[PDB]
Design a protein around this ligand. Sequence first.
Ligand SMILES: N[C@@H](CCC(=O)N[C@@H](CSc1ccc([N+](=O)[O-])cc1[N+](=O)[O-])C(=O)NCC(=O)O)C(=O)O
Ligand SMILES: N[C@@H](CCC(=O)N[C@@H](CSc1ccc([N+](=O)[O-])cc1[N+](=O)[O-])C(=O)NCC(=O)O)C(=O)O
Lengths: 217, 217
Amino acid sequence: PMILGYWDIRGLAHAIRLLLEYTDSSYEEKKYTMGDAPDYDRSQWLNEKFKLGLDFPNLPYLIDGAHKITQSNAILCYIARKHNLCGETEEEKIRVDILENQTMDNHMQLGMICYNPEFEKLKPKYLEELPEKLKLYSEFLGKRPWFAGNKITFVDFLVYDVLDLHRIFEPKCLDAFPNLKDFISRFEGLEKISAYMKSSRFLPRPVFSKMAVWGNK
Amino acid sequence: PMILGYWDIRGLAHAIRLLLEYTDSSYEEKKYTMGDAPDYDRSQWLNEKFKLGLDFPNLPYLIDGAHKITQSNAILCYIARKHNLCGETEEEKIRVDILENQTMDNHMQLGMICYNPEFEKLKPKYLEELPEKLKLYSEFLGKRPWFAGNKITFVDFLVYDVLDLHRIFEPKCLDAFPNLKDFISRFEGLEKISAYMKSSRFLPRPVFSKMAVWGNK
Ligand SMILES: N[C@@H](CCC(=O)N[C@@H](CSc1ccc([N+](=O)[O-])cc1[N+](=O)[O-])C(=O)NCC(=O)O)C(=O)O
Ligand SMILES: N[C@@H](CCC(=O)N[C@@H](CSc1ccc([N+](=O)[O-])cc1[N+](=O)[O-])C(=O)NCC(=O)O)C(=O)O
């Protein structure tokens, strides 16, 4: 069975875990524990980091037999390809590519301030800007059932994670975009998704690692 | 003809410009000018940002008729797909995916400190770490003519820009990895590449925008 390595948190592995579940993939998980402050001992991972045969050692990392992979989006396409969720038409592949990177951006943005000691000070501006960000995704999705088009793709998992992370950060954020709310309903309503969410495996928190100022627990 | 919008600098548009050239693509450039300190007036771009019909307004952006694209890596695949440089075999697509993101990481890393006011203080550590970074690419490439494998792909443009930016930042950096040096020789040795470098179009500097503390000019 495949084996997904990551910290004992949600973070970046979220969309992957969801995808793996949606695809009925056979897998295990090698969760790494980070020590408490002030050191935040990472040795559990560092003692293994370069022993796994990974090309660019990192987290998350996926191991499927002889295939060792790093970089979240790389791991997602890998999985998605086995179930034709990496896109089909031309326009689909474009939307996929754009989102694939757009979400990664918007994510690192939140991550950056949530790990910034001055989070409290920065928070005001970030929130002032967020509505427009969400709007973009609303406009983008429009009347489509999924982001790529009529068929679901791995990018839907990425958009979800991002959108979800924001209802958690600011609950009223998605209130102004019905289609987005429906998207979340539609995504969580997915049979294998719904079931996974009610299982013991579902790890929706902590959102970030112990070093984080927000969602660190 | 296609139209590539970006700042009047190298930056993220570099690999794209190189690819476009190597593919003999018919295109123009909409270069945006940033005002001098302390305001760094961006208005030339802001007054157009939401008028272009882009989905997620940003730079660089590519316009091919009805197709409006953002996110550098999104733009690269779009172009590479028209010429079969987006990867073919399974293992090829993996390497492409990994590098497509790996390079983007290593890039932002450099960008972050080069835009950091305390650049001078941060520089010492970054340099202490760089060798291992480069080594990863060397190990990765190994005895292959190209990163993807025997055929050249758009990621080779990404790896080049990164490797190039680092010889500029620290000339002796690549000295310990012959295969990487040969890679640089082999890439610039490409007919259309070589030619483009001797042209008036070649924009290798400034490396970053005016806001940068390094390579700002
Ligand atoms: N581009 C890579 C990024 C991988 C990465 O950064 N992994 C991190 C945790 S994520 C992370 C780490 C720091 C911050 N931060 O804000 O400081 C935010 C996030 N995040 O998940 O957004 C890690 O611990 N890697 C193991 C290692 O480096 O050896 C990918 O998407 O796979
Ligand atoms: N993920 C996107 C990122 C796009 C982006 O960052 N665009 C910047 C320039 S790049 C950039 C900007 C800042 C820093 N920095 O280090 O501070 C590094 C880089 N970089 O290219 O590496 C911009 O000016 N966009 C127009 C807008 O936002 O309206 C992509 O790769 O296309």
